A paper describes a structure:
However, exceptionally high-level aminoglycoside-resistance is achieved by the action of intrinsic and acquired 16S ribosomal RNA (rRNA) methyltransferase enzymes in aminoglycoside-producing and human pathogenic bacteria, respectively. These resistance determinants block drug binding by catalyzing the transfer of a methyl group from their cosubstrate S-adenosyl-l-methionine (SAM) to the base of a defined target RNA nucleotide within the ribosomal A-site. Here, we describe detailed structural and functional analyses of one of these enzymes, the kanamycin-resistance methyltransferase from Catenulisporales acidiphilia (‘CacKam’).
To assess the relative contributions of these two interactions to the observed β6/7 linker structure, individual D21A and W203A substitutions were created for further functional and structural analyses. In contrast, substitution of the universally conserved W203 to alanine resulted in complete loss of resistance, consistent with previous analyses of equivalent substitutions in KamB and NpmA. Changes in the CacKam-W203A structure are confined to the β6/7 linker, which is disordered in both chains. Additionally, D21 is no longer involved in crystal packing interactions made by either CacKam-W203A molecule. Critically, in terms of β6/7 linker structure and dynamics in solution, the intensity of cleavage at R206 (bands c and d) is increased upon W203A, W203F or R43A/R73A substitution, consistent with increased flexibility in the absence of the R43/W203/R73 double cation–π interaction to stabilize the β6/7 linker conformation. In contrast, CacKam-W203A showed minimal methylation capacity, consistent with its inactivity in the MIC assay.
Author numbering: 5 to 192, 212 to 227
Amino acid sequence: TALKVLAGKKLTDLDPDEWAKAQASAERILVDVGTGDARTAYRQAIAHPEWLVVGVDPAWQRMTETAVRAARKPAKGGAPNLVLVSSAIETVPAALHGVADEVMVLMPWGKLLRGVVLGEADVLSGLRAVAKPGAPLEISIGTSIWREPIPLEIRDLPELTPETVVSTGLTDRLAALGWQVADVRLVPTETVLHLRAVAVDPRD
C-alpha cells in the first residue's frame, strides 16, 4: 500500500501521506518507467525542480548510486523532487495508479523493451494504469539495437519502423488498452524511433 522507495542505498516504505503531499505540491508529475541507473531521471529532476520525477524500476540496486547523490543537500547536487520506486510496470502498486501527467519509456531493455515492441498487454496496461487521462506516453528506442549483434529479447522480432508499428498491429493493441497513438517518427547519433500516445478510454 505504501510505496517501496529508495533512500540512498536502503529501501524504504514511503509514507502514504507524504506521497500525496508531494504530488499536490508538484506542478507536474513525470513517471520514468525503466530508468537503469536512473541518472536520466536525476537530470530531469535537477532541470525541473517544480516537477515530481518518479523513477520506476524493478532492479533497484542499480539506482542506488543516483539515489545517494539525490539524497544530498541541494548545494551538493541534491534532488528532493526525485522519487525512485522499486517496482515492475506489469504489477504497479495502487499508489502509482493515475498519478502521472506524463509517462516516459526512454531506451528500454529486457521485458520492457520486448513488451513495448510486441505490445504485451501486461506492460501496456501497466503503463496506462499510472497515467492520468490525457497524459502523453513517450517511447524512445534507438534503432541501432537491430544491428548485429542483436540483443536476445528482440532477436526474433523484425526492426520496429513507423510502417511496422502499424503493420504488426502494435497501434491496434495500444488502442485496445487505452493508448491513442498521436505520432511516430524516426529521428537521427543513431536513428531513434519516437512514439507518442495519449491516455484515453480503451476501445479497439
